[PDB]
Symmetry: C4
Subunit: 201 residues, 4 copies
């Protein structure tokens, strides 16, 4: 309805922006496709909508929208549902396109990512490429060590990801501190295969 | 007028949101009813309205809207009206529905609640259920001990509540510090019946 | 133009708010008059307008709008115009109505006030009433001592005031620290007449 | 399209603002010209547009819009493109008019400036005037010493500048710390000609 119109009017706004800045045709179409995969023809002022509600209704909503994500990921599926709800209410949906570098190996990490749908490639100068996909997560190491990205991560397909910031990642682990051990265990496993080890875990 | 229209257009926005995320029929009606109890057919950009005013007019307004809350609650009714005004200007109105868990026993507390209208149930694994209702308040213990919720609290009816955040709760007790003793006294009483005691009070 | 319409539509929004909360007739008219003295039939999204500009244009604008305030107040009139400009760009315009208590004697101070037009009464339990008016300022003591209001201040007429917050008051005195001595001198004078003295000045 | 209309309606809003505050004719035209050089007939809610996108698309966009700035400025042109991208995503576009004092010699520095197009004059009481122009930058010293502006800087022509705040300047140099040495080297050179020296560099 008026969400279909909001999508349209917002995209025309994007169209005049690229017109104004004279971006090439291929870049414009790339932005067109992002816009279609990410919003799918409707646009919602989601912060304002859920802010009209209360905690229980918001929590009931995120749990419904993410049933598949929760169900297919053992970390969430077997955890205390209150831990899950706390994580879910802070996830932010993001779409990446084939070839995008989601994470660069040198940099500082400010967020981790949960793969709802898609394939990514884990890359280090000096090892092979492992694939991660639906039900998996990545970017957690830098969050735990407070260090620097131990690899680059690259979208292979269109990716529908849910991201979690370092602050919210930590606010949720102060609460429910048993769950940090669950993250470190897999992080230790993954480091041991990329020829790495680290005392901090 | 245009507040009746704002209610309508905002709710249709909510309607397309649940349509987009394919929520079941019972959940949609539950959200419909919340929306009717909480906004009652009109929607006001209340932050912007009261921000157009000045301190005295804002203070005169909250005191008028809350005469009954103040009058039926001894803590406010017999306190220094400036203490009351300071508390009132930071309360945030909230509606909960039957069955909602307002507070879960394990968690960290970030706010307390004043009952304008409604009945709630106080619940601990290992004690009976006490009811609280109009003129009463709850969630104050965690605010004082800076600890962890000593019980769960559950809406029995539709509840019209006014919430107060930990920060504002503390900003108002630094000012007017005699009023903290008033909170602790009742908190000590309530702990002594749920078989509990605590040195911090 | 569309600022006259914005005034109208915004006020009708206020009208439905008081209708919804059933405020009495005298309080509604009091709010009507405030709205007319404060906005004078036009409403401007002033943060957004001046944010479209740059520093020099903003500084040239506040200096023009406040020529009279600056010219009739020795503190500003003889100060370094850069000090003045720094103060001016942080002033916030406020209107008070006869009888309003602008400052209550017990409380914590978070701002001071510069009188563009109007008369106020300085009040302490145990002294006479001094009047301040156009070209004068007040609320500065608590800002300097970081203490507690040494008196109440009460609008006698409609007052057009410019307020300055404690933070901005301090950001401007770290810069230009010679000007704090100018404030303390008058504050020491005013304390000595209300039978008071204070070491911190 | 609707960006051309947004320019128009926004400018009429500015027009009623100056009408309301009765600004003289020359000042109004000065604001008219600023508005034309700065927005060029179109207005975009740029924060919201780029916020609809993702990191890679935003980074690809700033890099395209600033190809000339990057290419003509050795500091950026020969640096690690990730350093550049980090700087670019935090630049804020600004237009200054002939005669404006961009930086005053006494003051505290909160930002530096990169000259996309324009000529400025570097001024100290007690030295000659050096000109800087396209491809050059200034305001970096105060950012490095955390001190006080070592000179005034004055627009000679219309200037199209990109500014960088002290915080973002520092967030980017914690990352990529080799680039601070590049700034200090030129800062040391520039100080040595204005008869100055400083241990902190
Ligand atoms: N054998 C490995 C090693 C690392 N990784 C992920 O790559 C991420 C890159 O950034 P990070 O924040 O260091 O966390 C890393 C792992 O999730 C992985 O998925 N498999
Ligand atoms: N006998 C008792 C014990 C506790 N309570 C309230 O339950 C709240 C649960 O969270 P809280 O923040 O620990 O504060 C508690 C009391 O208000 C109560 O109302 N009666
Ligand atoms: N003789 C006096 C004493 C005090 N005052 C002002 O009253 C203000 C009340 O709050 P304040 O922040 O303590 O600063 C005080 C003086 O400006 C005044 O105007 N004349
Ligand atoms: N010989 C010099 C000396 C100083 N400058 C610039 O002037 C700026 C004024 O503020 P700043 O922040 O101290 O940084 C200074 C230099 O960029 C310059 O461009 N050439």
């Amino acid at each position: 309805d008026s969400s279909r119109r909001q999508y349209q009017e917002k995209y025309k706004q994007v169209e005049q922006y690229m017109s104004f800045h004279k971006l090439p045709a291929d870049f414009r179409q790339k932005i067109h496709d992002y816009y279609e995969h990410r919003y799918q023809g409707k646009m919602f002022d989601e912060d304002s909508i859920l802010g009209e509600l209360n905690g229980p209704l918001r929590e009931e909503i995120v749990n419904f929208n993410c049933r598949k994500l929760v169900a297919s990921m053992p970390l969430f599926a077997n955890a205390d549902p209150n831990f899950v709800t706390a994580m879910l209410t802070k996830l932010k949906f993001e779409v990446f396109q084939p070839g995008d570098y989601i994470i660069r190996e040198g940099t500082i990490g400010k967020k981790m990512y949960f793969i709802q749908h898609g394939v990514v490639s884990v890359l280090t100068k000096g090892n092979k490429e492992m694939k991660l996909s639906d039900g998996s997560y990545f970017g957690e190491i830098c969050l735990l060590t407070r260090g620097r990205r131990t690899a680059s991560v690259r979208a292979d397909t269109y990716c529908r990801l849910y991201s979690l910031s370092v602050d919210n990642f930590n606010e949720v682990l102060e609460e429910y501190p048993m769950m940090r051990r669950a993250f470190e265990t897999v992080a230790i496993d993954r480091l041991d295969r990329i020829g790495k080890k680290n005392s901090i875990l």
